[PDB]
Amino acid sequence: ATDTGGYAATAGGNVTGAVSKTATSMQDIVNIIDAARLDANGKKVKGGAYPLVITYTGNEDSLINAAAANICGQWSKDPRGVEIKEFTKGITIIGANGSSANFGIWIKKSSDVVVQNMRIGYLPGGAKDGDMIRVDDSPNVWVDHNELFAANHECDGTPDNDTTFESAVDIKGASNTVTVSYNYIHGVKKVGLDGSSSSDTGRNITYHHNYYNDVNARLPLQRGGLVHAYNNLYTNITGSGLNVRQNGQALIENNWFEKAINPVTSRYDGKNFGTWVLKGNNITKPADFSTYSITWTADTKPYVNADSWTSTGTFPTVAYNYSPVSAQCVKDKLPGYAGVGKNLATLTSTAC
The missing domain is CATH 2.160.20.10 (Single-stranded right-handed beta-helix, Pectin lyase-like)
Incomplete structure (x- = not known):
């Protein structure tokens, strides 16, 4: 249903005609969303052509473990993240048990987006907006059952002395209704x-x-x-x-x-x-x-x-x-x- 236990009311991609896809990497997620914008004739459809349920099976533990061992080397690296921009047909990104990501999910001017069971940690690019999850101008978004973590620590000499790591769940703009539930957030400064x-x-x-x-x-x-x-x-x-x-x-x-x-x-x-x-x-x-x-x-x-x-x-x-x-x-x-x-x-x- 659309009940999230909060202000957001969405089923995400779990609606009628949803197309299920498996993403084994960050790049698959990007490609899968792009393909979801084309109609039967190969032309782009504003807001997306069909609803999606992406099961992410990738695992980036090696990246995460390497980052954890050198906390202060993350802020200056390139940020990594999948952007969900202007996709309103409905989409759910759910991680398979055992999956992990060293990249963020940036939602912008979209709606009816659900992000679940994703383990995201120690993201690079704190000095360049390397947020774990960003909800910008996006209503009816449900961020549920995720583990978002880093180290609750600030390294010396980072820009503004506030960029060792970016935030876990940032909401801004016209994201009028949002529900953030069942997340295990630990080791996060902001x-x-x-x-x-x-x-x-x-x-x-x-x-x-x-x-x-x-x-x-x-x-x-x-x-x-x-x-x-x-x-x-x-x-x-x-x-x-x-x-x-x-x-x-x-x-x-x-x-x-x-x-x-x-x-x-x-x-x-x-x-x-x-x-x-x-x-x-x-x-x-x-x-x-x-x-x-x-x-x-x-x-x-x-x-x-x-x-x-x-x-x-x-x-x-x-x-x-x-x-x-x-x-x-x-x-x-x-x-x-x-x-x-x-x-x-x-x-x-x-x-x-």
Whole structure:
């Protein structure tokens, strides 16, 4: 169906007349998408000629393992990624169990795109936009059950001292409805944007059932819009978590936070603070901060931390249907449903 447990409502390429293809390499993916633009007469069709289900069977572990051993040699290399530009017929890129990629998926001005079961890590080209997954001007995109990783570390002398590795899931532009779920994101300094600038405000994004471990910041860095974060496991956040900016609104419910600095905040602009509605998280009052090693820091510009752990605004009625398990169940069970090789399994209260 089209139910993703979030704002995005798409079946991707799993629709009527979908054509299944197997890609054994990054280049196959590129070629497969190109072929999908031609009609029965060999002429290009705007938005694509037919829906696609690409099963990626390639494995780039040698590239990944080599990169892991020389972290600081990645940022200056050429970035690698498959671009899904202006393809609206519907497409799903799903990795076969055991597949791996040292390249990113860049979605631009497309719609109804699903990316699942992909293990992407240590991408080269952090200094030249080497994002793992990018959603730009693309509504109805579902990024589900992937493992996105690198090293939560910044090498010396990188451009802006911020380019050792690019982000895991960046959302910007008119990507009006997006769902980011069941991903195992670890060893990432900048997890992802939700708006590329002060002017790029908006969108309705849902982050659910993601397991974050050893990440520094941007979970996400929100600029306006609505963000619904539920059933996520946030551990070892070394910088800040959800940064709600430009009057954005967030509903933060039934998540488990632990060993996190500034888990919920609004900083870096000095104005137009966003709001949040907190409910059902493992933290319920400031007394719980010590229990779960939650630390807070100030910023040089005016900011707002959720150190009182109280709701600071409201949130409109959630459109879709979802059934969150308890925060405890997340902490107990989530690590077994999030990521690759889980056969796209979901956490239900029955499993709690």
